[PDB]
Amino acid sequence: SGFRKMAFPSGKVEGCMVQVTCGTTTLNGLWLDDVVYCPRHVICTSEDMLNPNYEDLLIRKSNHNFLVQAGNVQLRVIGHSMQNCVLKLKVDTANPKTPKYKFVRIQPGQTFSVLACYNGSPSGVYQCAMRPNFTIKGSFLNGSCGSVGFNIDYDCVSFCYMHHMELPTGVHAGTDLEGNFYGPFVDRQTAQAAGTDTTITVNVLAWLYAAVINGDRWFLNRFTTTLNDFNLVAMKYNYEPLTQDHVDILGPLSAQTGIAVLDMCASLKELLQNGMNGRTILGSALLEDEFTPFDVVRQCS
């Protein structure tokens, strides 16, 4: 019993973190097989940050412009290339700790664990969600660029995020491990702002189910609704539309608790319309939306 925000065990990823230095810039890299992955903005100096020409910056670089350090051991760089916004450094040594892995691009609303690192050294791990506006509400200080996000499926590490930048709101932006940004962002120092965010409705429903499983039942009621009526409420309160696919995904939790999704939607409708009346759900006074249905099943069953 109990319900906590839980991250995946990070050991398999810890063995892949290295330090990458180009000139006076030092950040984190991911060492898998004989390649190190890091943000391409490592090749930028301060005179380049506002309008970098990454093509020209890279062709000017040679292998000897990069220092890769794995703990106390220097890895010799024997090749370099760019894939989108990620720099790929070929090294002369394959990482003996490389886990079974794949690169996976996630969708908004999906969750993942982040291994926050500084100077190639793992510092902490936390769980977060890709927001509908394609930012993440991370916790990053200067030097965390290149920290990665991941899930573990059976025994395979699915890498889904590399950290690139902090936006003026304090939220964070990054890419998949193939260098494609999440969200309408570019790797430059320029006027960039997160769009207005929305709440991840299917995750809120998942968390209400977790609340019921844990004995919190005060928000349940006799009423049911329709997708159509609920989605007009959702739009009203800046909640993502609920789709039929979302309903099917919650099917398991609906079957285990006796509260059909549209039954629970009537609870959520009511909580949006009237509120929590001074009460809490799972120790929170806000409606939590960074647990997926998968996350709830994994932790509650």
Ligand X SMILES: O=c1c(O)c(-c2cc(O)c(O)c(O)c2)oc2cc(O)cc(O)c12
Residues that are catalytic: 41, 145
Q: What is the secondary structure of 211-254 as a DSSP string?
A: HHHTT--TT--S----HHHHHHHHHHTTBPPP-HHHHHHHHHHH
Binding footprint of ligand X, residue count (CB under 6 A): 13
Coil, strand or helix at 146 = coil
Chain residues 178-237 in contact with a second copy, contact rule CB under 8 A:
214-215
Residues 122-126: contacts with CB under 8 Å, at least 24 apart: 122/10, 122/13, 122/14, 122/17, 125/7, 125/8, 125/10, 126/5, 126/7
Cα–Cα distance for residue pair 28/116, rounded to 1 Å: 10
Candidates 17-25, 104-112, 206-214, 241-249 — which segment interacts with Cl ion by CB under 5 A?
Answer: 104-112
- Could you say which residues in the range 106-165 bind Cl ion, by CB under 5 A? 106-107, 110
Q: What is the rounded end-to-end Cα distance, in angstroms, of the chain?
A: 10
The owner of tokens 């051991």 is 73
Of 137, 188, 216, 224, the one binding ligand X by CB under 6 A = 188
To a second copy, the closest distance from the beta carbon of 5 in angstroms equals: 6
User: Least separation, in Å, of the C-beta of 289 and ligand X?
Assistant: 25
- Which residue has 């890091």 as its token pair? 38
User: Is residue 11 within the footprint of a second copy (CB under 8 A)?
Assistant: yes
Measured between alpha carbons, how far is 6 from 297 in angstroms, rounded to an integer?
A: 13
Residue 85: contacted member of a second copy, Cl ion, Na ion, none (CB under 5 to 8 Å, by partner type): none
Q: Which is nearer to Na ion, 118 or 239 (CB)?
A: 239
Residues interacting with a second copy, by CB under 8 A? 1-12, 14-15, 115-116, 122-126, 128, 137-141, 166, 170-172, 214-215, 280, 283-286, 299, 301
Residues interacting with ligand X, by CB under 6 A? 25-27, 41, 49, 143-145, 165-166, 187-189
